[PDB]
Write a protein that binds this ligand. Structure first.
Ligand SMILES: OC[C@@H](O)COC[C@H](O)CO
Ligand SMILES: C[As](C)(=O)[O-]
Ligand SMILES: [Ca+2]
Ligand SMILES: [Ca+2]
Ligand SMILES: [Ca+2]
Ligand SMILES: [Ca+2]
Ligand SMILES: [Cl-]
Ligand SMILES: [K+]
Ligand SMILES: [K+]
Ligand SMILES: [Zn+2]
Ligand SMILES: [Zn+2]
Lengths: 110, 274, 114, 274
C-alpha cells in the first residue's frame, strides 16, 4: 500500500513543546520520493516493518556501548503507512543510544 | 571561588576529607571519552588511549572530564571539589569524541587498568547485552583486587522489568543508580536485582572542557561518587581488599526503599570508612 | 503576521471524525525550507498559505465560499496536518459534516489542493 | 409491508393522523436536490428546477427524496410513512446532483414557493454567512404567510460558540436541531440562541432513489419533521397564521434541557395541533 510520512528527531521525551532537531518527508507510491536523502532505501526499510515501526529498533548494534548521561532524544513517524494512519514515537536515553539502537537504519538516515 | 557540589556532603565525603583522608596514593582509572588534563581543577597523572587518532589526555566530548571531576576535582580556590581530591587520576580513553565505544575497546581499557595497578575502575557507560570478553575482563579485574564501579543505566522502570545494563549487571561490578538532592530516585535510573547502591546523579555540577564547568544528569554522574568513595576508604584503610571496600559501601548505605529501585541505598562514605 | 522556520508536513483527508481506524481518502507531503518541496502538487502556494496562518492552522478555514450552501446530512470527513510547522511540532485535525461542507469551507485553499 | 420510522410516534404525528388530520390540501415545498417523483411511496404534484439540465421531478443525489419522504411518504402498504402523508408535495430543485447549491439558486426557490402559494417551505441545507438577498427572500415568505423551516446545521458545539448556519439563523426561519430515538441531542447538532426546536435527526429511515429506502443522519432529517408538523396543524386549523403555527410548535415542545443545546425542546405535534 502507499505511504506518505514525516519523520522527526526531537530533543526530549516526546512532549509537544520539544525542540525539533531534524525532520524529513517520504512518499512511497509509484516511486520512492520525498526530501529524504535515500528514498528507495527508506521505503524498502519502511515496507519491511510490515506496518510495525517498532521493527526499526529490532537490529541494534551488538558491539557498541554509550556514556550513561541522560539527555533524552525521541524519534517520531506520522502520516500514512501502507494506506493506514500512524502516529508513532520512540525515546532513547541520549543520541549515542539512538544511533546504536537504530544502527544506520535507512528510515532515520537523514 | 571553589564550589562544593551537593553530592560531596550528601554521601558524607566532606566528613571523611575533614578526617584527613582524601584518596592520596589511590589509583583511579576513568574509562571514558578521555580527560581534559589541561583543566586547572584536574590532575591527570597517566592513562592510555584505545581510540585510534585520539590521545588519552584530551576529551573532545566532555563526558569523561565531567565524570573525572566528580572523582578527583582538586581541593583549591577554583571550580569544584571531587569526592577524593588527592587521588592519582588516570584517563583511559575507550569512548571516542562522539561518545561511541566498542566492547573490545572497553575490554582493552579494563585490562590496561588491571595490569597498571589501578585500585578503582570507573565505567560511566553501558551497553544492552555485554560480551564474554567483557565479563572475563571485569571478573579478572575484581579477582585481582580492583574495585570495579559502573553506571547502572538510564533505562528507567517498566513494571518489574530488569533494565540494568552491562558492565553494571555483572556480579564483579558495582551497579550504581541515581538519586537527587532529596535522596529520591531519578526517574531515568535503571532498576533490577543487580542494582547495588545509589549516589547523586541528578543536577551534578562538575568540570567540563575547555577549562569550564557543567551540570549533567545520569547514572554516569552517580557512578564516580562510588568510585571516589572507594578511594577515600582505601586512603584511610589501605590493606582492605576490593570485596571488603565493596561490602563496606553497601552494608553502611542509607536505606531509601525497595532494593529493586534503590539497591542497598544511598552510599554513606563516613560510615563505610569508619 | 506570518511564521518563520522550516516545515515538514503530511496532510491527509480521511473518512470519519478523526478516529485512528478511519479510511484514508488522500494524502500528500510538503517541505518548506530554502525551496518549497514534497509530493504536494503546488508546493510554493501550499507553503505560502501555511506560513500566512502564523502557526494557527484553523486560519485555513477562515475564507469559506460566501455564496455556497450544502445539504445538512451528516457523513463526516476530516482533514489532518502532522509534522513540523515552522519549527514547531503539530498534530491538527478538522471535521466537516460532509464533503460538500469541506469543499465550501476550504474554498480551493492551496494546502488541501491535492 | 409499511414501516413507521421512530420519528413519526416520537413527535406524536401518529396521534394527529389518528384524529384524521394528515396534511390534506396543505402545500409543502421541499427546496433540495429534487424528488424521485416516480417513487411508489411519494406523490409529487408540482415544483420547479433552478439547476442546469435537471427536471424538478428527478433526484440524482438522494437527499431530496429522503427529506420529502419524512414530510410526505404515502400512507399505504409499502415503504415508510411521512409526518403529513396527505400533503400536496412540491419539488423545488435548488441543489445539484452533488448536493451543492448557490445562494441565488436558494433565493430563486424561496421566491418560487412564495409566488406559487406554498404553506410551508423546508430547507434541509445551510451556508455559513447568508446574504441580503437570502434574508429578504425568507423575510418576504414569512411576511406573506409561509411557515419557513430549516436545518439548524451540523457544526456541533465548541464551548459557547454559536454554530447555527443560514438560512436557519434568520428570525423569519425555524432553526431545527437533531435528537435521536432517546430524545438526546445528536453531537453534530448546531447550537446557539437561534436554535428553536428539535426533531428526530439520527438514524432517520426514509424514501431514497431509485424506488428504495435509506437511513441518514443530520439536521436535514430533523427539519422535514417540523415542516410536516406545520402541515398537520394547518390541515386541522387552516386559518391559523404562519406565526401562530410557529408559536404552537415552540410553545408545546417537550423541554429536554438548556435552550442553547435544545431550543424549546422536541416538537409535540399532538399538543401543537390541539
Ligand atoms: O391551502 C391553500 C394555500 O394555497 C393557501 O395558503 C397561502 C399561503 O398562506 C401563502 O403562500
Ligand atoms: C515560529 As517563529 C520563529 O516565526 O516565531
Ligand atoms: Ca577545585
Ligand atoms: Ca553488578
Ligand atoms: Ca408508505
Ligand atoms: Ca431562525
Ligand atoms: Cl446522500
Ligand atoms: K476543529
Ligand atoms: K468549520
Ligand atoms: Zn517569525
Ligand atoms: Zn383545536
Amino acid at each position: 500500500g502507499p505511504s506518505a510520512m514525516v519523520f522527526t528527531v526531537i530533543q526530549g521525551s516526546g512532549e509537544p513543546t520539544d525542540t525539533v532537531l531534524r525532520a524529513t518527508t517520504l512518499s512511497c507510491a509509484y516511486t520512492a520520493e520525498g526530501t529524504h536523502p535515500a528514498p528507495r532505501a527508506a521505503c524498502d526499510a519502511l515496507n519491511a516493518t510490515d506496518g510495525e515501526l517498532n521493527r526499526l529498533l529490532a537490529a541494534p548494534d551488538p558491539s557498541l556501548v554509550c556514556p550513561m548521561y541522560f539527555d533524552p532524544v525521541t524519534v517520531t513517524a506520522d502520516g500514512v503507512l501502507n494506506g493506514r494512519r500512524v502516529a508513532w514515537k520512540h525515546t532513547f536515553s541520549n543520541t549515542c543510544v539512538m544511533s546504536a539502537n537504530l544502527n544506520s537504519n535507512p528510515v532515520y538516515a537523514f | 571561588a571553589q564550589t562544593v557540589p551537593y553530592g560531596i556532603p550528601l554521601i558524607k565525603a566532606d566528613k571523611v576529607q575533614a578526617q584527613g583522608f582524601k584518596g592520596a596514593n589511590v589509583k583511579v582509572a576513568v574509562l571514558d571519552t578521555g580527560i581534559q588534563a589541561s583543566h586547572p581543577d584536574l590532575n591527570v597523572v597517566g592513562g592510555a588511549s584505545f581510540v585510534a587518532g585520539e590521545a588519552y589526555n584530551t576529551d573532545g566530548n566532555g563526558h569523561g572530564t565531567h565524570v573525572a571531576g566528580t572523582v578527583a576535582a582538586l581541593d583549591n580556590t577554583t571550580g569544584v571539589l571531587g569526592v577524593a581530591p588527592s587521588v592519582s587520576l588516570y584517563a583511559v580513553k575507550v569512548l571516542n569524541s562522539s561518545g561511541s565505544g566498542s566492547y573490545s575497546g572497553i575490554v582493552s581499557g579494563i585490562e590496561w587498568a588491571t595490569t597498571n595497578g589501578m585500585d578503582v575502575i570507573n565505567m560511566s557507560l553501558g551497553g544492552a547485552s555485554g560480551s564474554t570478553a567483557m565479563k572475563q575482563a571485569v571478573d579478572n579485574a575484581y579477582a585481582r583486587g580492583v574495585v570495579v564501579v559502573a553506571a547502572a543505566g538510564n533505562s528507567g522502570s517498566s513494571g518489574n522489568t530488569n533494565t540494568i545494563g552491562y558492565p553494571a549487571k555483572y556480579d564483579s561490578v558495582i551497579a550504581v543508580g541515581a538519586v537527587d538532592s532529596n535522596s529520591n530516585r531519578a526517574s531515568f535510573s535503571s532498576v533490577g536485582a543487580e542494582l547495588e547502591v545509589m549516589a547523586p546523579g541528578a543536577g551534578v555540577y562538575s568540570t567540563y572542557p575547555t577549562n569550564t564547568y557543567a551540570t549533567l544528569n545520569g547514572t554516569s554522574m552517580a557512578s564516580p561518587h562510588v568510585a571516589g568513595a572507594a578511594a577515600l576508604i582505601l586512603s584511610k584503610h589501605p590493606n582492605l581488599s576490593a570485596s571488603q571496600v565493596r561490602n563496606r559501601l553497601s552494608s553502611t548505605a542509607t536505606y531509601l526503599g525497595s532494593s529493586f529501585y534503590y539497591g542497598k541505598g544511598l552510599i554513606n562514605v563516613e560510615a563505610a570508612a569508619q
